[PDB]
């Protein structure tokens, strides 16, 4: 992209939806890519996320006040390209450039999902999926996460 702005108007602001204790939403950052909608419907098999409204006011969410509690729900954090959906437990604790990445395995079940353990200064910061086509692909369970 370009290195400067020529937008001289005020910006849209969107209210924040609540969808459980795991995924925090700041939906003003959403870019309406519908990755989360497609993941919930196709991978998780839950049709509770969609778009409401039209045009510039189109909003991603549940319309009603509803939690998105699925054993795969945390994966929408990874696939959201922006900070619209983020890990609530991880909030504010670290920055990516300072974390050490340890490639490891999950022991919360017998699948053996491949993971990355992000550490910083000798402390575990979070757990991310590690791509393995023959096991977990690029997902993990919420318990693993």
């Amino acid at each position: 992209g370009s290195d400067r702005s020529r937008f001289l108007e005020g910006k849209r602001a969107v209210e924040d939806k609540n969808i459980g204790p795991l995924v925090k939403t700041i939906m003003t950052r959403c870019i309406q890519c519908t990755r989360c909608i497609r993941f919930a419907s196709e991978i998780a098999g839950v049709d509770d996320l969609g778009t409401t409204g039209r045009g510039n006011d189109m909003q991603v969410g549940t319309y009603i006040e509803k939690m998105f509690m699925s054993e795969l729900s945390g994966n929408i954090i990874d696939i959201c390209p922006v900070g619209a959906l983020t890990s609530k437990p991880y909030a504010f604790t670290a920055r990516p450039w300072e974390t050490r990445k340890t490639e490891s395995i999950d022991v919360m079940d017998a699948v053996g999902s491949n993971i990355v353990v992000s550490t910083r200064t000798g402390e575990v910061m979070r757990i991310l999926p590690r791509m393995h086509e023959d096991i977990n692909e690029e997902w993990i369970s919420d318990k693993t996460r």
Binding site: G1, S2, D3, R4, S5, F7, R95, W97
Partner: protein, 385 residues
């Protein structure tokens, strides 16, 4: 052959330089500099920094010529980035490059005189240095390690009223050089300590890798500001002083005359300073203005990324050199395509100059070695790196 190696059977500490000399009576027969006493592994540390993070390391090399060291590094990065700084930044860099030359030659000449007894010009001229430290502090907030010259231009614009004060300082400075010359130039004791001392031929100087005054003292007509100009040096007029005897006295005269020519350049920089921005108007290299950063989405992203990852430099390698106050100062800088330099070899002019100390000191007495080390103008921040 008495020996002075600073060890058992010789109780004395050495300091910044450990000179192992073997003397026959009064004459020096071998001079063996032992360095590394200020080696800090700067070149290795730079490999862990981003290009902006590594910039302050160059203030701390020739720590008498700080902004000139910044300029050499900035030119190398700009060359690899394929960008250029704007004209006002280039004129500011030439202005402070010549102020920095005054800072260095005052230090070089007056401490050289102090090391051999003339202790008074050091005090008169270090008041001038103190005033020039104020110009550094007013543009950057630091008296020495300004970190002011950066790839893309300079960090900040001159504060209002700074140019007027630089004019006032320059208007009187030549009379201070005259007072320095009244103490040294014609003094028979000064001439007896420097005339026909450390004579180097034009061919030996080239093959030994000398640069700067160490070349021009022996008559070689070379100055990178003329032959390989950079920034806006091809728009100011000045004369290159040239020696004839290639000894310590001619190099002292060259350095004094270069201070006068530096004032001559500074006079043109003040008059020809153009308007405009001070860093390249390319926010993928130079951070945006703070007011832009706080209103524009693009500006905030680029500020964020410039101050964390830094800008990527296209892969390549360059040897870039400038006419620093002490001679040719250059960097061989290797880019691997990322935001941290892969290798940064620093070419310090004093490194080759010191390696020629044994050659230059042949046939001289012990106290002449003080004058030879003085005439080479050695800072061990750059020699050891």
């Amino acid at each position: 052959n008495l020996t002075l190696n600073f060890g058992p059977q010789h109780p004395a500490a050495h300091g910044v330089l450990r000179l192992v000399m073997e003397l026959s009576g009064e004459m020096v027969r071998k001079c063996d500099p032992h360095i590394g006493l200020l080696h800090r592994g700067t070149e290795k540390l730079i490999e862990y920094k981003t290009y902006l993070q590594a910039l302050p390391y160059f203030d701390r090399l020739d720590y008498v010529s700080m902004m000139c060291n910044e300029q050499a590094y900035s030119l190398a990065v700009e060359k690899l980035l394929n960008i250029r700084p704007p004209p006002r930044a280039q004129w500011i860099r030439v202005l402070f490059g010549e102020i920095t030359r005054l800072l260095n030659h005052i230090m070089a000449v007056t401490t050289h005189a102090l090391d051999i007894g003339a202790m008074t010009p050091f005090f008169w001229m270090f008041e001038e240095r103190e005033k020039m430290f104020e110009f550094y502090e007013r543009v950057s907030g630091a008296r020495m390690h300004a970190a002011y010259v950066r790839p893309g231009g300079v960090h900040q614009d001159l504060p209002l009223g700074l140019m007027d004060d630089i004019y006032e300082f320059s208007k009187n400075f030549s009379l201070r050089i005259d007072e320095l010359e009244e103490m040294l130039t014609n003094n028979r004791i000064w001439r007896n300590r420097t005339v026909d001392i450390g004579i180097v031929t034009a061919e030996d100087a080239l093959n030994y890798g000398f640069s700067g005054v160490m070349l021009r003292g022996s008559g070689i007509q070379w100055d990178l500001r003329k032959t390989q100009p950079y920034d806006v040096y091809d728009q100011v007029e000045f004369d290159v002083p040239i020696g004839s005897r290639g000894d310590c006295y001619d190099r002292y005269l060259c350095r004094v005359e270069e201070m006068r020519q530096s004032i001559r350049i500074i006079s043109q920089c003040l008059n020809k300073m153009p308007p405009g921005e001070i860093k390249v108007d390319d926010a993928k290299v130079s951070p945006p203005k703070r007011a832009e950063m706080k209103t524009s989405m693009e500006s905030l992203i680029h500020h964020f990324k410039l101050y964390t990852e830094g800008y990527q430099v296209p892969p390549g390698a360059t040897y870039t050199a400038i006419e620093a106050p002490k001679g040719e100062f250059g960097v061989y800088l290797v880019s691997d395509g990322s935001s941290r330099p892969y290798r940064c070899k620093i070419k310090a002019p004093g490194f080759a100059h010191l390696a020629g100390l044994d050659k230059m000191s042949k046939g001289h007495m012990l106290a002449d070695v003080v004058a030879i080390i003085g005439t080479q103008d050695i800072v061990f921040g750059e020699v050891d790196r």
